[PDB]
Amino acid sequence: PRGSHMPEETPMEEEEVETFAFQAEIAQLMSLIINTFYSNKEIFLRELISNSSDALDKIRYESLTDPSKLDSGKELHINLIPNKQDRTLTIVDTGIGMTKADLINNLGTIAKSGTKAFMEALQAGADISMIGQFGVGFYSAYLVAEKVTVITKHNDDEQYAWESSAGGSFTVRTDTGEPMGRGTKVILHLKEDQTEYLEERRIKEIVKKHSQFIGYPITLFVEK
Ligand SMILES: Nc1ncnc2c1ncn2[C@@H]1O[C@H](COP(=O)(O)CP(=O)(O)OP(=O)(O)O)[C@@H](O)[C@H]1O
Ligand SMILES: [Mg+2]
Incomplete structure (x- = not known):
């Protein structure tokens, strides 16, 4: 006979x-x-x-x-x-x-x-x-990243993660993170002195400079 169970139970x-x-x-x-x-x-x-x-x-x-x-x-x-x-x-x-x-x-x-x-x-x-x-x-990517993870989904296979911190090896694993649906996500884990590439102004600058002729829309998501 119980009226109330606590979360740890x-x-x-x-x-x-x-x-x-x-x-x-x-x-x-x-x-x-x-x-x-x-x-x-x-x-x-x-x-x-x-x-x-x-x-x-x-x-x-x-x-x-x-x-x-x-x-x-x-x-x-x-x-x-x-x-x-x-x-x-x-x-x-x-x-x-x-x-x-x-x-x-x-x-x-x-x-x-x-x-x-x-x-x-x-x-x-x-x-x-x-x-x-x-x-x-x-x-x-390794100019600015100490580690790179690649999450990807192709119509003909399951969702996979590739990852490497360089040093001669990489891993490939099945991934049950948030499902992707279709496409690729490159996740750069930036080196400590390369944090300018997290600033919205710098990101806009370099897309404007180098990626002006891309035939698909690019959106920047900026955390408030
Ligand atoms: N966003 C992404 N989506 C799908 N495949 C990707 C990808 N990023 C990289 N790849 C895969 O990784 C391969 C190697 O990429 P890169 O190192 O840029 C040489 P490339 O782009 O194939 O050469 P190219 O510029 O001579 O055409 C691509 O050919 C592709 O198969
Ligand atoms: Mg390429």
Whole structure:
């Protein structure tokens, strides 16, 4: 016989993980990117927004051939979410997303034919901006980020998280966070001295400077 139970008186989820070694020259690039000073680091955002733009082109075309592909969401766009509390900058798109095998192949495991050429150009003093011509622009994220997590959902697979703090390895895991529906979320965990990339004025400045010709709307979400 009880009139009142207190809160302290009232199941284990199981996530599968896989750990991968970066391709040798990818790992060398990452070290070079992380451990060398570059001015002009702001170009990281151009590279990530170009990737979103490419993934949005892909879904726009796939869906011409099959309206069914936009069942996972019709709106084609990019959102930028700085968070000063946890020091993350999140780039979200509703492009094609990546399958599990896409993450494993495209972000780290397969050799890229421009990496050796990029590393020589950089050691000769090329601006890191040149990274966009060498097919390795994703890694520019590590100019400003100590860790990068990629959350992604493709129509043909489940939701996956890829994550890396560099140092030769990344992980891919099944993700049961907030469901995405379709697209990719790049979550940059900013290095302590790179917090300017959480300011609304700086974000507007660099989109205006470098991402003026993007054929999808970009919205900035600013916490009050
Ligand atoms: N937002 C995103 N959505 C979907 N896939 C993405 C993505 N960001 C990155 N990727 C995947 O990661 C791959 C590698 O990206 P990058 O390092 O920028 C070279 P790229 O953009 O493919 O080269 P390119 O500029 O020569 O065309 C892309 O090709 C894509 O498969
Ligand atoms: Mg790219």
